[PDB]
Motif scaffolding. Structure first.
Motif: not given
Ligand SMILES: [Fe+2]
Ligand SMILES: CCCCCCC#Cc1ccccc1/C=C/C(=O)O
Length: 647
Positions: A347, A352, A527, A531, A647
């Motif tokens: 993650h 990110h 992602h 996520h 996010i």
């Molecule tokens: Fe995330």
């Protein structure tokens, strides 16, 4: 000629401005002054006809100056379009999509887009070189912790360029009952039910988390499918204690049949475990061997909780046949280790942090007018804001991670450092990753299937746009900006990633496309797949323990008491829920659904429209096959795969 000039202002609370804005129409053959054309109204398009008795020819830019009286009052400009009425030419598109601050004069090039080589006359040369110079001064590299891939400079949100900050409306909207039960029993597994539960799948997790099938199922279609792989040979760490011949045979059988799989958490070895409130927390680097059954289930065969030390007897190997609590405990250890590796590596790092590298590198090397810039920007939206917020509360010292995760407190950063070595080019490209891990063909893996399909769809989109600007491999080779971009990523942002398989230059159309696809996929599919599942698998603490209170077993005499004593306590379990739940309760832009238009042409838009068509068809088809599925795999459905890491 007579033109209809139209100016668009953002919809955010502060997009409007009270200052008048002056406009200039600059074409290849002279320019004109339009003067103070308007006073920007939030969420309003302002159009007005104007007749210039001069021949401008094809329009190249639109200059603007925001003249302020007493106070400056910022303005968010979406774009400006000037349509020549009467003449049969096209509406000149001048993309802006940014904040206009200061009384300085700015020039917005027409959105057709071009490479230095694609602009022989050098009409936009002066502009792009100076835009880049300003870009490099605004977007600088940095390092939150030594030994990691680079991030954006500064440490606070206010250190980010104004164009990277959440638009006011998103900012405000984005920003114990358990304590009641603070006097409630904590002796059995059932006590974990006091948490709260939130979704169809999560409830399932709560109802069957002890199922070996569900346990192994997660390696394929759970929140972290990035670890599992087909065994070519038995892991060298898998050494057998005396008397394990039977298991060894069963393993050999599965190996020969090619249905033996492995999930090795060696990455966790030697990582400093947290100490929350002066109490020692524990970690494990287990190994799980599973077998893919003809009926489609991936079942756990053995679990090793410690890496064998050279010169000493091998550690125990737990089996589904051991006492219930012994086997259950070993599985909890694996679930806990997965949670750590998932959050930090799959993650944070792979999603990110990678995105941030691509973001910074892009802002520093590709000018707005550049084709690739226009293709990528939508997928970079809000990445810097979210990441900065993460390093200011989530992973920062004394942050949330330090408060509840067993890797928190320093180890998390070590893991992040050690993990950099494994950020290989192939691992970011499904066709390559899935192949190397022997997942190609495993019909039980919806992740692999959806990952491949989504990759192909994005690949075609990239190729389609790149094709309109790079008609030859020579065209890509000669693109200096593109080349510097590639280097800024590989050599700089990723710190010598060429050793891990990353390109230091792009020598062909096929290679450049592959690289852009890799970036775009990492910021969306990569992602989303990681996520989205958090709320489903990580809300039932037993299935994903944030921390462990006792060290891993070295014997086979665990009791339910042992299990409870190891698992997170009430407070910890609750804190885990809060973090996961809040960080997942999702406003948002679905893949390919970005509204801002950076390209002018009809072709660039046709390619995008096809991209959207395909995504829609993929989404529908997934929805369908999911209705006939025991546990629907939805993490790669384009309707919910986000357009960027936000996010
Ligand atoms: Fe995330
Ligand atoms: C900016 C998001 C960074 C995500 C990686 C670092 C982390 C974490 C974490 C640990 C335990 C529960 C939840 C979270 C984050 C959840 C989320 O971002 O949705």
């Amino acid at each position: 000629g007579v033109y209809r000039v139209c100016v668009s202002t953002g919809a955010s609370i502060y997009a409007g401005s009270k200052n008048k804005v002056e406009l200039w129409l600059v074409g290849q053959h002279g320019e004109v002054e339009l003067g103070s054309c308007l006073r920007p109204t939030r969420n309003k398009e302002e159009e007005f006809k104007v007749n210039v008795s001069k021949y401008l020819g094809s329009l190249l830019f639109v200059r603007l100056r925001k003249k302020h009286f007493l106070k400056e009052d910022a303005w968010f400009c979406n774009w400006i379009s000037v349509q020549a009425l009467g003449a049969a030419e096209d509406k000149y598109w001048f993309p802006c999509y940014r904040w206009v601050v200061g009384d300085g004069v700015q020039s917005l090039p027409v959105g057709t887009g071009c490479t230095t080589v694609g602009d022989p006359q050098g009409l936009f040369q002066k502009h792009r070189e100076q835009e880049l110079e300003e870009r490099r001064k605004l977007y600088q590299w940095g390092s939150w912790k030594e030994g990691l891939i680079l991030n954006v400079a500064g440490s606070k949100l206010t250190d980010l360029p104004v164009d990277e900050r959440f638009l006011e409306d998103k900012k405000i909207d984005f920003e114990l009952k358990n304590s009641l039960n603070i006097l409630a029993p904590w002796k059995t597994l059932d006590d974990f039910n006091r948490i709260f539960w939130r979704s169809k799948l999560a409830r399932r997790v709560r109802d069957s988390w002890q199922e070996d099938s569900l346990f192994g199922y997660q390696f394929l279609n759970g929140a972290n499918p990035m670890l599992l792989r087909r065994s070519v040979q038995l892991p060298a760490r898998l050494v057998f204690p005396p008397g394990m011949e039977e298991l060894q045979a069963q393993l050999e059988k599965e190996l020969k049949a090619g249905t033996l799989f492995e999930a090795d958490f060696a990455l966790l070895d030697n990582i400093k475990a947290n100490v929350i409130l002066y109490c020692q927390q524990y970690l494990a680097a287990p190994l799980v061997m599973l077998k893919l059954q003809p009926d489609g289930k991936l079942m756990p065969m053995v679990i090793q909780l410690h890496l064998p030390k050279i010169g000493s007897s091998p550690p125990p190997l737990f089996l589904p046949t051991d006492p219930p609590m012994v086997w259950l405990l070993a599985k909890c250890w694996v679930r806990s280790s997965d949670f750590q590796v998932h959050e930090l590596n799959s993650h944070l790092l792979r999603g990110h942090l990678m995105a941030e590298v691509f973001t910074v590198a892009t802002m520093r090397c590709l000018p707005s007018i550049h084709p690739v810039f226009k293709l990528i920007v939508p997928h970079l939206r809000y990445t810097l804001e979210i990441n900065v917020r993460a390093r200011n509360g989530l992973v920062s010292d004394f942050g949330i991670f330090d408060q509840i995760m067993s890797t928190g407190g320093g180890g998390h950063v070590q893991l992040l450092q050690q993990a950099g070595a494994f950020l290989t080019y192939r691992s970011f490209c499904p066709p390559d990753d899935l192949a190397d891990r022997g997942l190609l063909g495993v019909e039980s893996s919806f992740y692999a299937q959806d990952a491949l399909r989504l990759w192909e769809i994005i690949s075609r989109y990239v190729q389609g746009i790149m094709g309109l600007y790079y008609k030859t491999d020579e065209a890509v080779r000669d693109d200096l900006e593109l080349q510097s971009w590639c280097r800024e990523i590989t050599e700089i942002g990723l710190q010598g990633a060429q050793k891990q398989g990353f390109p230091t230059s792009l020598q062909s159309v096929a290679q450049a496309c592959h690289f852009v696809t890799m970036c775009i996929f990492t910021c969306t599919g990569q992602h989303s797949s990681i996520h989205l599942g958090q709320l489903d698998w990580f809300t039932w603490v037993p299935n994903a323990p944030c921390t462990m209170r006792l060290p891993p077993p070295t014997t086979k005499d665990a009791t339910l008491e042992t299990v409870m004593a190891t698992l997170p306590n009430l407070k910890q379990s609750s804190l885990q829920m809060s973090i996961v739940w809040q960080l997942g309760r999702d406003i948002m832009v679905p893949l390919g659904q970005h509204q801002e238009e950076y390209f002018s042409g009809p072709e660039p838009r046709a390619v995008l429209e096809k991209f959207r068509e395909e995504l829609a068809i993929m989404d529908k088809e997934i929805e369908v096959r999911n209705e006939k599925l025991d546990i629907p795999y939805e993490y790669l459905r384009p309707s919910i795969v986000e357009n960027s890491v936000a996010i």
